[PDB]
Ligand binder design. Structure first.
Ligand SMILES: NCCc1ccc(O)c(I)c1
Length: 113
């Protein structure tokens, strides 16, 4: 399928134990996709002071369109040193590995895969 319905755990930035997916734009997009498929991906909502507490390159989920079955349609955009790889809509947040942190909420998305 071109899209997959996911329910992503929303994590507090200070709880996140593994604060990025890797060291290059291509690696972080690859790892983010693998973690989304394996159900081991969390979401941090971006507010003042969040991104400096996480590791670059960043992987964002961004709105790709305007929401089936309650799931907002999203795609992945990576960011390194102020340059973005991909073009999309409003940031829903930053993806990180999930290693069992307790979420504050779940965010339903339809991921372009
Ligand atoms: N064709 C790969 C299957 C798959 C399932 C769920 C996902 O979240 C993702 I990304 C890929």
């Amino acid at each position: 399928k071109t899209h997959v319905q996911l329910s992503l755990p929303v994590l507090q930035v200070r709880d996140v134990l593994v604060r990025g997916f890797g060291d290059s734009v291509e690696e972080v997009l690859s790892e983010a996709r693998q973690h989304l498929k394996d159900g081991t991906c969390g979401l941090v909502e971006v507010e003042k002071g969040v991104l400096p507490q996480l590791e670059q390159p960043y992987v964002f989920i961004k709105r790709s369109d305007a929401a089936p079955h309650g799931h907002v349609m999203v795609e992945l955009v990576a960011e390194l040193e102020g340059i973005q790889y991909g073009r999309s809509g409003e940031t829903l947040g930053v993806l990180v590995p999930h290693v069992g942190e307790i979420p504050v909420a779940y965010r339903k998305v339809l991921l372009r895969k």
